[PDB]
Design a protein around this ligand. Sequence first.
Ligand code: AGS
Ligand code: PDM
Ligand code: CA
Ligand code: MG
Ligand code: MG
Lengths: 153, 780, 142
Amino acid sequence: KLSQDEIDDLKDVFELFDFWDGRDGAVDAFKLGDVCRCLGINPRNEDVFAVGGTHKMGEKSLPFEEFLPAYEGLMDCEQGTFADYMEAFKTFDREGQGFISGAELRHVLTALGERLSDEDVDEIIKLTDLQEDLEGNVKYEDFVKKVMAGPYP
Amino acid sequence: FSDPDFQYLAVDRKKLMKEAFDGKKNCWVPDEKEGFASAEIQSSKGDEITVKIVADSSTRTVKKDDIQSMNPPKFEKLEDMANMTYLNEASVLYNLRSRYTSGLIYTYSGLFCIAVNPYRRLPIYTDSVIAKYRGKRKTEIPPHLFSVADNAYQNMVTDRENQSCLITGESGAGKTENTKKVIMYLAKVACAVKKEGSLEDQIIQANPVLEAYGNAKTTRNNNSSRFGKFIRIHFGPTGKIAGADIETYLLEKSRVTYQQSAERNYHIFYQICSNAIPELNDVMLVTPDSGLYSFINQGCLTVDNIDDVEEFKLCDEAFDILGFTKEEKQSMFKCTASILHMGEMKFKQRPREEQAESDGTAEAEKVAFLCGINAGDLLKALLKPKVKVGVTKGQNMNQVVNSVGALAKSLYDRMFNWLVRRVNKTLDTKAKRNYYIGVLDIAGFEIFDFNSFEQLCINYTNERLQQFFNHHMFILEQEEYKKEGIAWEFIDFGMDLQMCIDLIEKPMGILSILEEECMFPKADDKSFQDKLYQNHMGKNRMFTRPNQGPAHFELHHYAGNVPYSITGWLEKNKDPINENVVALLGASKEPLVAELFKAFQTISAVHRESLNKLMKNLYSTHPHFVRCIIPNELKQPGLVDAELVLHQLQCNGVLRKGFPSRLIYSEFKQRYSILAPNDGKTVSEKILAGLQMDPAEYRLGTTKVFFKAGVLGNLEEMRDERLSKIISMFQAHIRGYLIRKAYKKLQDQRIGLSVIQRNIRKWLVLRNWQWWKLYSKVKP
Amino acid sequence: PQKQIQEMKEAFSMIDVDRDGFVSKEDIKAISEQLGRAPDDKELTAMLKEAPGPLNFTMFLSIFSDKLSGTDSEETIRNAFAMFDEQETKKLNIEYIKDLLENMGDNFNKDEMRMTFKEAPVEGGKFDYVKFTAMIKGSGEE
Ligand SMILES: Nc1ncnc2c1ncn2[C@@H]1O[C@H](COP(=O)(O)OP(=O)(O)OP(O)(O)=S)[C@@H](O)[C@H]1O
Ligand SMILES: *[C@H](C[C@H](O)Nc1ccc(N2C(=O)C[C@@H](*)C2=O)cc1)C(=O)O
Ligand SMILES: [Ca+2]
Ligand SMILES: [Mg+2]
Ligand SMILES: [Mg+2]
């Protein structure tokens, strides 16, 4: 299960989300997944729905005695090892050196899987600072490392 | 070696020298024009590999999948293609194609002997060649039919067994031509040593005969074989040819009087009236036009490269040496020309009522002389048939005009029958036989728009050879089942094919019906369409089309489903000749006639056996398959019809059927590691094991690994899906990364807003405090 | 709080008409009438109880130090805004801070929303929270 100290990581963050959408003791369902991320987790989209959650802010307000039991689930679900990601990306590398063309990155991050947002990808880059060589390719291996690491190394 | 005059039957010189290849950039991509095309991948965007056409340097796009993988300039114009690192649906073309444009015309490619029609008599058949392939095995001498026999010779003599030599392909693919050359080859090698043949020229010469009687120019080609053949050559203890014997099959009898268009009735007719033998016209009462006889002047009357003249002169000489006599030879042509006039006996819709009437007599009378019997008894009993029930009858306009179209037909067939009969006699030398070699040439499956009984035959007869090859092909695995030692004794395949063969011929099958539904003049086609569906309807597995016509039931065959139409089948199953004529002719003067009509209820009853024979004879002969392919419909040499060849390939050996699939342990790495991402065989070894792989769906070997049914496919899905879920966790991880980044401010602002929001919420309360207003009121 | 006191007394002189030492209940109705909208009876009465005893000046500076307790520095206030202005414009798009109050933290209630922006130094969709804080309580003029 979870630890009191662990829940202290949930209690501190919860009262922080319910605050932005008005202190009423209830957090916006859609905002729920974006919360669960504030605890060293990276649950999948579909999954975050498998435990309530919504999209447009104005469907359901979750309280606490209910918010927690939800975390109880999105905690025994799959996280991507360095391998998995590596093996995947590889399934796009033909040459061998291990380089992925530009467009492709912004492509796979959107096209396949679950496109998320032009902005996002443009942010994930402008952020973890990934620069394309002088031809038009970036070594994904070195990229996926930065993501896994976290914004605060 | 060197380079004698091997310029065509050898992949000559060093074009193999100068110039530029990558297992990626280069590859094959679809192309509506020349089949597939060479390209250079110029960018990869996921499920849509963008490449560029190296030819016109264009830049199109093609889905990863559809792409094909190109072989290196190493295996360029390879011989036994089986060696290519890549032997896919596209790699095969680049090779064979480059070869046809070189007049190569031979590649064993694996276990076969592929050979594309050249359409230009090659010089690669001279004795120098024949001899150059004497005793030589097959892996040193350039690839060519020849050796295919020299091997089928020692793989005989030395093996004390028998060798068959089938020749597949489509129509006009060039089989009933190479079967000839295989005969000629066995001649020019193992020899035994005014009047007759040299017992070579006895066999080799026995061609223009059955050809100028069985081969006719049909839209497709110009010398199409309208009859099956299975020549067998026997060998004496001295490993020398000691015996021959031909074996023909279904003949196109309906061709005798009809040529839809651009077709010519059986060759002979067109040459008999060429005046090749002036001193013979007045022996057939024939005057040469063959544009004058309704029976052969329907379709085109002169194919472009066939000089009937020499074709006849030669056909003449053929008989002599073949072992004929003035009589026999002549008698023959006589009964031959007969048919010609036989179709010139005009008739009159007589009674202004509806009855029996002679139109002229001058013609018909002529027919009575050739054949023998008197025009009287003939034209008479021809119009007033006499065939009781242990009485006299009456024929109408049709019952007569449609009557000759039975006699003459039934004749040619009987003639052909005696013809081959005669031949197989002049070359059956009751010598000492020990083992016979043998070639079989018969166009395979065919699916015309309107399928009739004749089609059922040709297809059926062809679907029985399938179970042969398909069987003699299973063995070839149960041999690489051992090399990789796995023994898949957990396969009951091959019977599904016995769903048509069995049904089509069993004692209760269609042939069994149409063969019994005649033991009574109650040949009502409606009582037939029923009885059939009264025994084989909805029980088994066989029952819209464009430009397609009428049909009564199909048959899930192999190369497809043939919608058969039993319309007017019965009468077609035999000879509807007015017995009045038969017995009549059966007493004629000419020996040929009488013997042809001297004295097993027919033609299911001739084929249900002739085939059983052939088959139960081949399954005792180590096969040697050869596939023929037609380059172009234009029949002009040098060209290659992309989509064409490709097709002809997916029917033979491009492998397969519903056997397992094998995949090298090395390659298994890349499209399957990801299913358990947590060297060689060792790598995969665990994956499946841990994947709890239903342990009955595989057998690990030494060359590679084997799977049962379309499972690799079953796996492929576990990939396409799983692989994507990975991308998900990642993108989801990316989301779980961003939030963190903002959480600092998402919590930092928390206090920021709480500042204003509370500062003002405490400012208003002040601006609403009696005292303050009072103070501000007083701000002097 | 020093110079303010000096200005406080000034606010003590005007109120104390009769200079009866103190602000007689009547000294209020005084300047106010001679100056504004004289408060209702009770309004006045219950306006004195707000102070423990008879108001001289010390009691005047008293009841005035309470309603000024939690007065976060003008800086912390102006620096609290810029905490949203992630562009250093010393400004916020009105519809923003607007929604940033009425629906954030504590539902700025409708009423409190209006009474605020009523004088809001807004202009061109902008919103100078700088001059607004400077006005919310502080420098400017008296
Ligand atoms: N190797 C060859 N060299 C030269 N011309 C050939 C060659 N093979 C075929 N041809 C030509 O193509 C023609 C037709 O070939 P055939 O051998 O008669 O066809 P086929 O394969 O027997 O046809 P089907 O299946 O019975 S319709 C020959 O008559 C030649 O004119
Ligand atoms: C060739 C016709 C052709 O190319 N098409 C087909 C060939 C093979 C098959 N198979 C098998 O080989 C086994 C089962 C099956 O469907 C179907 C179509 C011809 O003229 O012989
Ligand atoms: Ca809330
Ligand atoms: Mg032929
Ligand atoms: Mg006073």
